[PDB]
Amino acid sequence: NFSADIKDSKAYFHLLNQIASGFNETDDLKRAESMLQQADKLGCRQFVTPADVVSGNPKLNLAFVANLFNKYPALTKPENQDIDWTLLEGETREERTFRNWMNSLGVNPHVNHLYADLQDALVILQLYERIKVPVDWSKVNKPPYPKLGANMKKLENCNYAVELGKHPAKFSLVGIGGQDLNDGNQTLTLALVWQLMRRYTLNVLEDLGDGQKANDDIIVNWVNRTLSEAGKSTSIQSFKDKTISSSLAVVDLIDAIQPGCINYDLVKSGNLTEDDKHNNAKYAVSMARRIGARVYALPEDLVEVKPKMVMTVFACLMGRG
Amino acid sequence: TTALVCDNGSGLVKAGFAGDDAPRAVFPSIVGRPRHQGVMVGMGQKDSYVGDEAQSKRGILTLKYPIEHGIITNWDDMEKIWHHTFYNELRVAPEEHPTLLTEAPLNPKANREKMTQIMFETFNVPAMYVAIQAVLSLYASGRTTGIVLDSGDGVTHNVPIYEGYALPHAIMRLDLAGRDLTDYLMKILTERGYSFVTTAEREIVRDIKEKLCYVALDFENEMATAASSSSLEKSYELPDGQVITIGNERFRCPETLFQPSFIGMESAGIHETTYNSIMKCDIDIRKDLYANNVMSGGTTMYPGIADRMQKEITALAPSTMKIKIIAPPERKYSVWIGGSILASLSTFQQMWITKQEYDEAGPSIVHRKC
Amino acid sequence: TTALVCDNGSGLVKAGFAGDDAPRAVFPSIVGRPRHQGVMVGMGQKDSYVGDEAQSKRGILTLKYPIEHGIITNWDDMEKIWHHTFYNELRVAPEEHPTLLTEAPLNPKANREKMTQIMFETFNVPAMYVAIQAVLSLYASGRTTGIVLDSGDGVTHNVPIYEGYALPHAIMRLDLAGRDLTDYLMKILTERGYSFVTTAEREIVRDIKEKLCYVALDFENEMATAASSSSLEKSYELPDGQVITIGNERFRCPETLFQPSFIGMESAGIHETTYNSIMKCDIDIRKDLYANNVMSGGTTMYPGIADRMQKEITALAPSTMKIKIIAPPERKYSVWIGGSILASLSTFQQMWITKQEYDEAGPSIVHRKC
Amino acid sequence: TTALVCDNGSGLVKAGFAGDDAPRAVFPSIVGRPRHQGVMVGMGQKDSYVGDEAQSKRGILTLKYPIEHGIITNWDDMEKIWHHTFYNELRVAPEEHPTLLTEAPLNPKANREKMTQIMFETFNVPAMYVAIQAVLSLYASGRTTGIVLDSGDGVTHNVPIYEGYALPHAIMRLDLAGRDLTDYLMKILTERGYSFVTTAEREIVRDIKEKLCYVALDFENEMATAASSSSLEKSYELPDGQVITIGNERFRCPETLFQPSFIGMESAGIHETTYNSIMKCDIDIRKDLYANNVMSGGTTMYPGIADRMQKEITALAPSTMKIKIIAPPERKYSVWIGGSILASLSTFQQMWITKQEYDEAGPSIVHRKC
Ligand SMILES: Nc1ncnc2c1ncn2[C@@H]1O[C@H](COP(=O)(O)OP(=O)(O)O)[C@@H](O)[C@H]1O
Ligand SMILES: Nc1ncnc2c1ncn2[C@@H]1O[C@H](COP(=O)(O)OP(=O)(O)O)[C@@H](O)[C@H]1O
Ligand SMILES: Nc1ncnc2c1ncn2[C@@H]1O[C@H](COP(=O)(O)OP(=O)(O)O)[C@@H](O)[C@H]1O
Ligand SMILES: [Mg+2]
Ligand SMILES: [Mg+2]
Ligand SMILES: [Mg+2]
């Protein structure tokens, strides 16, 4: 019952330790601090306050279980689908990269492939959310759709979406037709989306910058200054640095922020091999994602050296700054 | 970063990035507007169709080419085309790349100036450059001396170069190219009762021309051959399932290239124009010109064209000269190819027109820098 | 609140709310008046009968259709019908509901204007609209391209649409429909000696037509089969208990759709009308139309109609085209279903004609809005 | 002896003798066949009707025009019409007269060849000739310089001539003529509830057109005038005694000559067609073409047409050239009059295709001698 192990939030700490203990803090406020630390190691914080434990807030107690379980459903990580780099075949790499971006951003329907994915407004509308554009949900409807209430009502939503975006305009999207989502023209398809992702990244730069787009120099400078707190590795030198083995140092920087549950027995010295690099590519991504990083890059950057993507990690790092 | 090569022909749009061996996007240079009554709600929202979508749905649209005889006649639609190519076909931000553009010779200068203004003010590109198309063709060939015969959809022009230098006084241009041949084919298709009148039918007949026409080596012999036997007849299936048959027009159309009076034109044939251009040059370089005759453009893709030109110019030569025709398979893109080459050069990077320069000298700067 | 979809068909009235999958009410478009002495006090006070009441009591009534060939010929009776519709069949207050109305193309304009005035003044509807019936048929199919063949009780018309656009010059209309088939069946039934001359007898013949007739795939060998054997004959029972028998009339009646000369009409068959409508279209969309042939209306409910059309249109097509006919089970309500669909759309809500606009433009407003 | 002049138009047949100032025989170019069951012995033996007797008995006949758009589509009926012309209307033996025929430009070659073969092998004429109708029209005007606009029942075409020389590359043809206007009028007659379906009713509508239609000098204000007042309304009496009234379609039908979009065609109007034909000619002769715009054919007989043409061309002209249109009252027979003039000239007598030349060269001789 609630008064047994829930009024004190006793079970939640064991749950948090299961998905990462905690109950040993012996005091409600110390336990809540432990909960915040566990959240720092898990990323599930959306609404947590000390009243959940100190005052035993039943609304908070009943609400936070969703954050605990939905984010960690038996650790069924969708990236372990991407570990099959071509889990589907025939799609171009660029499309795969955009798909990954949407996957990282938590769009509620799951990704399958770019041609089937985004055949509806709901997708692009979720995108519109991430760009903070307001949405008239009253004009937004349902997905299953019967013979009555068919693709035509879908079309209502679809062209609605094209009025959207062109509301603040500037995205040069005039050529896009409101009926073409059903049509699915390939270049039209890619056109309407790539700029979106670019815009988002621009937003990221502005967000982590000092009121403007962040510059390359301050990136590595802050990284190294943080690295100075953990300088077992020398530094990061350039975005064009071929010695991608330095990825281990990215993880060490992570360790600097939080040493929790990392595998440095998995970690190997600078004389790495390509298999180690493949291992690293996914492992680092996983760690970052679980910490809370909205990782936009594909793991291949650890073997392909793409300067344009690496900033993804440093973003969340600066956020922790 | 990387420069952009856009070859804005009269008939086809050719574009891509520097350093590549082929253009990434090739599509017709047309704009289509609906020509009938929209009746289903939501469907009629689209006023314009630009690239290959215009061709597919041509059945309900009126087709306009923004370029005729290589002069941009509709400037708003040209903007539509450039927007389309930048954002849709290549999907890049023009503010981040220098761009290379092409032009035919003997053109009105304001055409050049306006395209400059557009690039710098609508797209505000970092830098740009405009080049003559035949020059790029030569660049595509790896040679430094020769006369280039260029024939795309709207203009035919000849340019000679010796050791990297052109000779402008001998430059000759003929407003006679593929589109006119198409119109003439329309004209003569009625003789068998085949009628095509609309802009959409024009594409059908252009396809017809591109698939069934050829260059005879002897016009009178082939005319007699057709007059005697049907061995030259060939058949074509129209989009609705109708099949038509031609065997005489398959060559009467390209002959206009050597007989412009067919369409009432007074100008001389391509062989003769080439020859006269050669005769306007120094007697000392003509021999080298005779050995390097370079052709480019889709209208230069007819079967037998190289041999016919070989024979004709041999007939015009002092007979002690050697006549050599150069006709690579990639003729269709030699312009864009030479452009990619040129733009990829480290030395060219100082030849770009920068926005700063434009901001002071206005659009006129192009006449100085190009 | 919610909208109303009333398809005043030539012989049948189809109606209901927007959002439902079937017209809530369906009844004959008739008015009856007594023709005999009312011998009982109090029972004869009712001067007119409208819906199924008219049909059930037809034994003592003279029946009339206010609409013929899709033109409203009796407006007062039509008003009776609309009153019955809304108040007795729907039991709704029209002042609270916008209303969607239907019409065949190529109709006299005054028909449309008068129904407009009626709705806004007699009924004072908040808003309304008049749409072409075949368009609704296409809405019902979920397509945006195809040709619709619609055949009700008064008119048979052809409408081609490509991508939500129609071609008015290619629209075909034929004043030959089910009522005509019924009258011709009445005529031919005299050769066996059966006679039907009164208005109620016509209803009986209509039941027979809807019960025993069919379209022959090839009429000639069918006539031969009926001439030799008797397997085609079938029997029907009259209300008094008499039985009649027919074998040959079962298919000679629907054949007039393909041979209008049976009733002396010079016009060509429905297949031929379809094909010619196709040929009036731009060559570039004919293939898709050939693939999208939509049937609609109670008359097209004959068994074998689609196969016969398939055969015939194949016989006319260039044989490379893939002929396809679409014949859903709910053909009898395709128009009304499409209307419900359309009324259900938020984007359509601004397309209504409000009474306010009418108060400015009079009934002529319909020609601009619809 | 003397030459026969036969102008075979799409709608009307003009025939006579050279040197006469008017055709001796003018009758419709039709063939009629019965479409009903004959019931009186000895009356149904006649299988076909050709001349004005077909027109008078059209109520029981189906009417076919052998020529459509200046193309002979049925040759057996064409032979019937030629037999009627020679033996019934003119009552002469063709074996004793050289014969001059007419044809439209941009026609298929088989048409001219087959008429040559028919004349030599069926009617066994001694000599023949095929002339261009517009050229004959210039002869009738007593001129050697000007651009001719010929408009009959099937074809509209333009031919510029300067000092006796044609400019074939500037000849333009439009398949829009009086028959199409008749069909359009039929379409728009239904707005008021008038219906015409039968080929005989088509002739009825053609009569209505020839009587009540005129050309508006400004279409947009004539529409407003008709919208606000009934002053333009006019009445017509049907053969059965019914009376119809039209007041808006009178100018809507002929406006199609300037707005072919009304019938769904992409092409431009007659005024722009003529202007383009002129702009295709040499800049030196354009003033003379502007001052000599010759009209011909029955379709050019509408009231107000010459004024509208002068106004539209003036709008298209550089405002310095004066614009003059020549429209003689004998416009309906200008082609035939010019034919009689040409056949009467002594310098023309060496230009007949003699039957000996035909016997040694086949039907293709007409291409070389005409
Ligand atoms: N195989 C072919 N045979 C004959 N003509 C062709 C062929 N391919 C293309 N053409 C014609 O050549 C033109 C090709 O356009 P292009 O050479 O790109 O001209 P532009 O440089 O003006 O765009 C088209 O007008 C087309 O009609
Ligand atoms: N099963 C059937 N077989 C043949 N004819 C039918 C059938 N059902 C209905 N009809 C005919 O269809 C007509 C009614 O069709 P409908 O589309 O409702 O016409 P309207 O729109 O004019 O009311 C009637 O004349 C009837 O004869
Ligand atoms: N006064 C008139 N007003 C309008 N149209 C006319 C007039 N007279 C004749 N027509 C039309 O002109 C056509 C016949 O013209 P004509 O030049 O004789 O044709 P064709 O060249 O085929 O003989 C018919 O379609 C007829 O309707
Ligand atoms: Mg080009
Ligand atoms: Mg119906
Ligand atoms: Mg004529």
**Residue boundaries of the structural domains of chain A:** 2-70, 90-208, 216-320
> With contact defined as beta carbons under 8 Å apart, do B147 and B278 qualify?
yes
| A4, D44, D172, D266, D284 from D274: Cα distances, Å | 98, 50, 8, 16, 17
Q: What DSSP letter does each residue of B286-347 carry, written as one string?
A: HHHHHH-EEEESGGGG-TTHHHHHHHHHHHHS-SSS---EE--GGGGGHHHHHHHHHHT-GG
* Alpha-helix residue ranges (DSSP H) falling in chain A: 2-5, 10-19, 28-40, 51-54, 58-70, 79-82, 93-104, 121-130, 151-163, 180-183, 186-208, 216-228, 247-257, 274-291, 301-304, 311-320
| B104, B132, B160, B196, D275 from B168: Cα distances, Å | 13, 12, 8, 41, 37
Distance B299 CA to ligand 1 centre (A): 5
Contacts of D192 in chain C (CB under 8 A): 108-109
Kindly report the CATH class assigned to A90-208.
Answer: mainly alpha
Is B263 within 8 Å of chain D by CB?
yes
Distance C299 CA to ligand 2 centre (A): 4
Q: What DSSP letter does each residue of C42-56 carry, written as one string?
A: TGGG---B-SHHHHH
Q: What is the DSSP secondary structure assignment for residue B25, as one 8-state letter?
A: E
Q: Which fold has domain C182-270?
A: Actin; Chain A, domain 4 (3.90.640)
CA distance D363 to D281: 33
Give the residue from D13, B307, B129 showing the smallest Cα distance to D5: D13
Contacts of C164 in chain B (CB under 8 A): 38-40, 42-44
Chains A and D touch (3+ CB pairs under 8 A): no
Mutate to test the interface with B, among C275, C283, C285, C348 (most CBs of B within 10 A): C283
Is D168 within 8 Å of chain B by CB?
yes
Which residues have CB under 8 Å from C285's CB, separation 6+? Answer: B59, B60, C145, C160, C162
To one decimal place, what's the resolution in Å? 6.9
CA distance D95 to D121: 10
CA distance B295 to A172: 38
CB contact under 8 Å between B34 and C317, yes or no, is: no
Mutate to test the pocket of ligand 1, among B153, B212, B250 (most ligand atoms within 8 A of CB): B153
| B79, C360, D177 from D184: Cα distances, Å | 40, 32, 11
Provide the β-strand partners of residue D172: D158
Give the residue from B9, B44, B302, B49 showing the smallest Cα distance to B200: B49
Closest CA in chain B for residue D167: B264
Mutate to test the interface with A, among C145, C330, C341 (most CBs of A within 10 A): C341
CA distance C236 to C239: 10
Distance C182 CA to ligand 2 centre (A): 10
For tokens 């009943």, name the residue: A62
CA neighbours within 13 Å on the CB side: how many for C120? Answer: 24
Mutate to test the interface with C, among B194, B240, B242, B243 (most CBs of C within 10 A): B240
Long-range contacts of B232-237 (CB under 8 A, 24+ apart): B236/B208, B236/B211, B236/B212, B237/C320
Sign, CA torsion D129/D134/D136/D138: negative
Length of chain D (residues): 370
CB contact under 8 Å between C287 and B240, yes or no, is: yes
Provide the experimental method for this PDB entry: cryo-EM
Residue A54 CA from chain centroid, whole number = 31
Distance C2 CA to ligand 3 centre (A): 56
Q: Is A76 exposed, middle or buried (0-12, 13-18, 19+ CB in 10 A)?
A: exposed
> With contact defined as beta carbons under 8 Å apart, do B81 and B13 qualify?
yes
* SS3 call for A29: helix
Which residues have CB under 8 Å from A86's CB, separation 6+? Answer: none
CB contact under 8 Å between C19 and A151, yes or no, is: no
CA distance D263 to C240: 56
Closest C-alpha to ligand 1, atom 4:
B210
Å between B227 CA and nearest CA of chain D: 11
Other Cβ atoms less than 10 A from the Cβ of A260: the count is 16
Nearest atom in ligand 3 to D7's CA: 23
Give the residue from D349, D334, D361 showing the smallest Cα distance to D23: D334
| Plot region of B171 (φ>0 → left; ψ -120 to 50 → alpha; else → beta) | beta
Buried (b) or exposed (e) across A194-213, using 16+ Cβ within 10 A? bbbbeebbeebbeebeeeee
Å between B47 CA and nearest CA of chain A: 9
CB contact under 8 Å between B193 and D267, yes or no, is: no
CB pairs under 8 A between A and B: 36
Closest CA in chain A for residue B94: A172
3-state secondary structure C201-230: HHHHHHHHHHHHCCCCCCHHHHHHHHHHCC
CA distance A184 to A187: 9
Chains D and C touch (3+ CB pairs under 8 A): yes
Q: Which residues line ligand 1 (CB under 6 A)?
A: B 9-12, 152-154, 178, 206, 209-210, 297-299, 301-302, 332
Of A139, A151, A156, Cβ closest to residue C142 = A151
Closest C-alpha to ligand 3, atom 3:
D210
Rounded to the nearest 10°, the torsion over CA B224, B229, B231, B232 is 40
Kindly report the CATH class assigned to B135-181+271-333.
Answer: alpha beta
Q: Which residues line ligand 3 (CB under 6 A)?
A: D 9-12, 152-154, 178-179, 182, 206, 209-210, 213, 297-299, 301-302
Is B192 within 8 Å of chain D by CB?
yes
> With contact defined as beta carbons under 8 Å apart, do D256 and D180 qualify?
yes
Distance D56 CA to ligand 6 centre (A): 23
Contacts of B194 in chain C (CB under 8 A): none
Q: Is C300 exposed, middle or buried (0-12, 13-18, 19+ CB in 10 A)?
A: buried
Query: For chain C, what are the domain ranges?
Result: 1-27+69-134+334-367, 28-68, 135-181+271-333, 182-270
Q: Is B278 exposed, middle or buried (0-12, 13-18, 19+ CB in 10 A)?
A: buried
CB contact under 8 Å between D35 and C71, yes or no, is: no
Specify the CATH superfamily of domain C1-27+69-134+334-367.
ATPase, nucleotide binding domain (3.30.420.40)
Closest C-alpha to ligand 3, atom 23:
D9
Q: Which fold has domain B28-68?
A: Actin; Chain A, domain 2 (2.30.36)
- Ligand 2 site, residue C12, Cβ cutoff 6 A: yes
> With contact defined as beta carbons under 8 Å apart, do B239 and C284 qualify?
yes
| B225, B285, C270 from B334: Cα distances, Å | 35, 24, 56
- Ligand 2 site, residue C154, Cβ cutoff 6 A: yes
> With contact defined as beta carbons under 8 Å apart, do D63 and D203 qualify?
yes
CB pairs under 8 A between B and D: 28
Closest CA in chain C for residue D34: C266
Token digits of residue A319: 């956020």
For tokens 């769904």, name the residue: D264
Give the residue from C237, C189, C207, C201 showing the smallest Cα distance to C298: C207
CA distance A209 to A227: 19
Nearest atom in ligand 3 to D178's CA: 25
Long-range contacts of D138-142 (CB under 8 A, 24+ apart): D138/D294, D138/D338, D139/D337, D139/D338, D139/D339, D139/D341, D139/D342, D140/D296, D140/D328, D140/D330, D140/D334, D140/D335, D140/D337, D140/D338, D140/D341, D141/D294, D141/D326, D141/D328, D141/D334
| A158, A227, A278, A281, B27 from A304: Cα distances, Å | 38, 23, 11, 10, 33
* SS3 call for A295: coil
Same fold, B28-68 and B182-270: no
Contacts of A177 in chain B (CB under 8 A): 45-46
Token digits of residue B210: 């591109």
State the first-to-last Cα distance of chain B, in angstroms, to the nearest integer: 22
| Plot region of D248 (φ>0 → left; ψ -120 to 50 → alpha; else → beta) | alpha
- Ligand 2 site, residue C321, Cβ cutoff 6 A: no
Å between C160 CA and nearest CA of chain D: 13
Ligand nearest to the CA of B205: 1
Closest C-alpha to ligand 1, atom 3:
B210
CATH of domain A216-320: 1.10.418.10
